[PDB]
């Protein structure tokens, strides 16, 4: 079965051509004799351009075929003008005219000298691989993919020793060690089949690891959580029963370590599991489950009175890290209430505990999330003392970090 | 050779005789012990001790 | 039929000799995972262990009897295999 | 058993969910085996009952046609519809 | 590979007493089967 036809141009786009040239009162006869001269000759270049892509080896015509198309049947692959005396340019093709349907069809000629030239990409280089090793393909990147009888594991000796080294080398004793390792998780093909054992090594270890606080063994976890997640092959939402608890820990927990010093790297843990964990609610969602379920622990891990501060600065900035519309309607009805934690623990002397210093950080976070809030859904006028309706907490300086944000979006 | 070779591997076999004795003696020992217990509970009993 | 269940054979008297999509059961959305967040909490053999092949493999289900009368298959008599994987058995 | 048991390798619980979810949602299915995989689906947790037994609540209806209003009465059908209800 | 004497009659005793003759038995061979230490095999 066949149904090929004979498509040709409409005549209806014929006579407009020609009676805007000065040639009136064409019959449809003579008119109908223009659009089948000239959808062969489409035709007849098309069929012709379709060897150039043939031999150079592509798939797609590109916009240079039928200019060497054109140039093959003695005619000039100028398409814009053309020169009777053909001296000026002899059969050089200009490159076509870049002109699009939707266009504007007029500029201004200093747009187009303003704005910055494309990047020139990479010069032409010779690379060599494997694509068989004595008739097996590896799997490097450049690749694309009675009693019963005593069983074997599911993982080879060799992907065992494997996950035994990065295992070994994930905990942080060498620190290239590491960056290698959390490299090979974050572009191993195979490293699907093992992720139950990584999974599991994970969430094991923060549990174990947050009975007593140990901070690099739980900030190097993170980062293996991270060089899991930007992995393209494997398949992640099977395991995420697993490594969310693990973050959100990592975030809402007590440091039985020292409690300051290490706390800028606590703010750091808290920093790394938000964003993972904002990075989870971005993948891997459905209907209700996992971004809905995560945001109701983080508000009432804040509505509860009376909270450890470090839990609070931790639920604090991963309720901070979700985006553009949370902050919008989730912080907008709370600013009292922090105030008023900040107030008493300015009040009670108690300055060797750790109260202070998780107020100091939540106060600042929350006054950088109100900036843009601000900046973003209202003018910047009146940005002295109007602040003070708010119970004046960043009121000027918090004008001049908008300010700041003001002056980044000027330079964008 | 994760990307082109492979090989199997087994569970560690424990072929010590000590501790193959160890195992069928506790385990003789434990379930006469149990066996004991059961058909002394379910019957008419006796005791060296009063009411034991 | 002398086997581990002749009780059974001697009293029967034998003689012879789009919520079924695949994301619905990922246990992300069927586990309270809630509960495992801590809060103020107070290799030439094998490295990790060797899973029942027959539970991580075999298709158990088709030894449910869904209707006693309508059964689809007709199931056997099953002898002991004694498992030597497991640990805790002497031989 | 599911609790003690279930292992990203062993799939026992996703397995015993599916095998409960396609006997609840197929139809011709008996009041009693309907009973059965309800009553497992409604003790293995609360998000089980949220994404599985609640978007067929409207199966009530189908079996409320069966005990508010039944051509046969003296069947068997109507202990095991409003056992199951 | 077959049970020893001991474990065949405690496998006995504790099956048949699981079939329904009394209750008494039965709530002891269960209570046997939930605190016994060496029951594998």
Redesign the interface.
Known sequence: KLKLSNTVLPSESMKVVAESMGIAQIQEETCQLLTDEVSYRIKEIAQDALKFMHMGKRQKLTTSDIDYALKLKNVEPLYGFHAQEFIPFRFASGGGRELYFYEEKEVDLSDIINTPLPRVPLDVCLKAHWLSIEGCQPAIPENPPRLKPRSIHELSVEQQLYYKEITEACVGSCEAKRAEALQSIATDPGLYQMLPRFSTFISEGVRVNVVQNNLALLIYLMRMVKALMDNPTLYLEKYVHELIPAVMTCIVSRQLCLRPDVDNHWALRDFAARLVAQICKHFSTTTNNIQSRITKTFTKSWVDEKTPWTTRYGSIAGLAELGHDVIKTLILPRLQQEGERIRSVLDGPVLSNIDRIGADHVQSLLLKHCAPVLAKLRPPPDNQDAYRAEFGSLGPLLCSQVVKARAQAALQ | PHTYIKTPTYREPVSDYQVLREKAASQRRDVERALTRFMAKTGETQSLFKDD | RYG?AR?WYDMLGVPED???AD????????????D??????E?????????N?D??YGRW?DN?I?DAQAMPRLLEPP???????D?????
């Open positions: 581990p009780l789009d919520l079924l994301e619905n059961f990922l246990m992300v959305t069927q586990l309270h995972w809630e495992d967040i801590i809060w103020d909490g290799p030439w053999y094998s490295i990790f262990p060797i899973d092949e539970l991580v289900e449910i869904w002898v002991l295999t004694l498992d030597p994987n640990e805790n058995l002497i031989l």
